[PDB]
Subunit: 227 residues, 4 copies
Amino acid sequence: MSLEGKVALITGAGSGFGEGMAKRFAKGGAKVVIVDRDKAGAERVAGEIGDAALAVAADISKEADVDAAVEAALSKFGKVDILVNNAGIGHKPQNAELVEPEEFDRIVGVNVRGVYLMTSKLIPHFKENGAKGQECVILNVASTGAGRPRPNLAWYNATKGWVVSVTKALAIELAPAKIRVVALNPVIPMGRLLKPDDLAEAAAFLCSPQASMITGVALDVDGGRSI
Amino acid sequence: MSLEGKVALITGAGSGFGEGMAKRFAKGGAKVVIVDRDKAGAERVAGEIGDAALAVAADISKEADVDAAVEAALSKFGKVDILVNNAGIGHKPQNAELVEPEEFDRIVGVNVRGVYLMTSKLIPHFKENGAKGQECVILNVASTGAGRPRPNLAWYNATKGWVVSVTKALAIELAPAKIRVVALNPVIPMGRLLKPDDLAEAAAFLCSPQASMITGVALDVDGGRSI
Amino acid sequence: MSLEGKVALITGAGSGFGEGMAKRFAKGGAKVVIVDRDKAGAERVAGEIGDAALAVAADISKEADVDAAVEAALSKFGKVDILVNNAGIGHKPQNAELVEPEEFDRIVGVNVRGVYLMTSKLIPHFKENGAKGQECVILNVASTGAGRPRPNLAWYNATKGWVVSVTKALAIELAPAKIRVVALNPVIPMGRLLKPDDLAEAAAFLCSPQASMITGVALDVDGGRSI
Amino acid sequence: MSLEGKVALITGAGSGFGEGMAKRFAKGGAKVVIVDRDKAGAERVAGEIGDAALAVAADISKEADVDAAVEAALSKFGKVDILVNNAGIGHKPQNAELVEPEEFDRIVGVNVRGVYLMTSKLIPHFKENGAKGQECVILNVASTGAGRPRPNLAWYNATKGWVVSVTKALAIELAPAKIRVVALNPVTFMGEDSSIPMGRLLKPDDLAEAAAFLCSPQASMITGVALDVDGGRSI
């Protein structure tokens, strides 16, 4: 019941962690907009969640797709309260200098430009919500690789460092507008793998009124791997 | 299931943040051991909570008081699953060089030795539980002063730096024993004060099975103050 | 004479910090390749240093300009031992949501893609030098805003977070190849403004053999701003 | 000659990193006060440097020893410009719960109380130098284990977290008095002689060079930092 009444828009929500978060948010009483590049993925997750979910196929590196995604969410649910920037792509592990410009550009398009587009497009609506006293949350999913890289994912890890840094910058700027901005760093000392439902719980907590005084942070959820 | 069935020993539980946590944990179905140098404070808080709370007067800077506290917790509740190192004393803000050795040594004795004593005394018990499948949590309450100091609390802030650092060291070492070790840093951009309520919610999340993959972290709860 | 016999390529070296480092490096006996989008400014700085300097006009957001710059460096001086990524652009301070895509993308082109392009194009050469027993250094100029943003520079500050993160990732990956990768964060409790020569000295230190055991760090040079 | 005319007091200077720093600072023109609990060690290092060096026997965990140490430095050299907090003790690697209170107390006494004593007793003099236009520096030697611990050194590492945190707290408070406070994080606890991404081990001279840079006018706008010198170990 923690998120009852709230509307969350979640990117990369057709699979893995994004799907886990959307299912968990919906179980908490939230309406969920399932945004993914994979249309079959988005539709399947929407189906499994049920009436609380809207499926939206989009390539968030593209301005037009973001605009369409946002319009569809607003049209279906009347407002957005929570944005989870979760979509991300990598490169296969390799020597940094072997990643070529096309691949590098694609990675930046989703992991950097996508976050920029999705966020800047929803900020005016969030500010409007905050003026009527309805607090909003932007949650960015980054990675332990942002601040604790191992070799061979240089360009991917750097986009995640961008995400953590943008989280702090937006948080200090948007706080007085009643918009919180947080991040999660998913990855092992605890001796088991991270499952989508683990990350989902941290996300539901951070996006709930139980975390109303928490903004600008990057929470590691990683079994102690970043230590 | 979250805190139902758990036993939490909380230091400095006779007022402020410590009291807030004890009441929040008890509401979650936990048993709580109310540890404070202030006997009347511990008894007041324990009576405000009722049958699920046990009062224990103790000066955690003293080894024999810690032992008696651990012994009374186990005598009463059979086990301890959660330790909250919350007890802390500071100095009146002042030029660093004006804090005299006697007062300095007192601050260290509670904020540093008290943590060492209460934690090292519960670890063998925590390892036994963890080995039997009952995961345990150590929660340390530090301060945003540890990493983001402002003038005139130098020696107080440094003991909080000690707390953040020991959280990390204990977490990496105890993770294989299935004991998590985490920290909170209570403090304003969000435009309002932090209440014991707020910090208690974060403590309840981090000490729950909903945080089973979170260890080694220090989470700021500060309305953005430290950005 | 600490940098005697070394060749440094410095981007954005036609003015400001970049120029200060170029002159300081040359005073330490290095040959310097002055790279800047502003041809007349690259020429000015090169002319002021003398025979030890080569002016090179380049838009580092374009692969063709990068390849040409690296070729010209190698053609003139036979090798490059030090790369300083210092070229950066930003936006007028303003609300984040008011920075439009064309401007957002241009900032990324210089601050993100330009560093990736210049760095990846030099790594094979740095690896060759490393195998011949010659230590190479990549110095990334980021900003205090990366980790301590103030409102209104969100997307700019984010690119600087990308740079600090890429410093760590490349440092871990390339250490075995005898290539150090370090960052500086220029900015005030010390009560005065930061001058080019202040940063220049930190740079000359980090790029010299006196720092041969320092890699993966981001050094704040900020009179205490980041504390 | 970057430190010519400056006076540096260095703790744990009887061996290892501290002895390395002391010789390096003296080569740069500084007078050096060699403070160590091991009296014979202090006297050896002072004798190896010459007239620029003064040996001082002190257990810096003790206020009385610290008072005598400071008085001796001022009476010999007339002033102190640089303080290096380098002395440190640890415990043998073991399960954290096995370190007993008496050992724990000893570690806090040197690594924590010792830094508090030496620094708080020099601050009023450092503020006088500051007011006269003479910049001072406090350099604290911490460790990569403060922010990046590995198992078995919990209580040692935590004292080094305290060092890093106090460096930040004192830096912000003391900056307007013209006193910088900085820290070094090197990866045996005092660097004494007879895996690493960079492919060799840290030597006292590596650490000494970083310290010499941080304590010089070439670093006049650097304060509040904790600089890792670890060959990439902490990344």
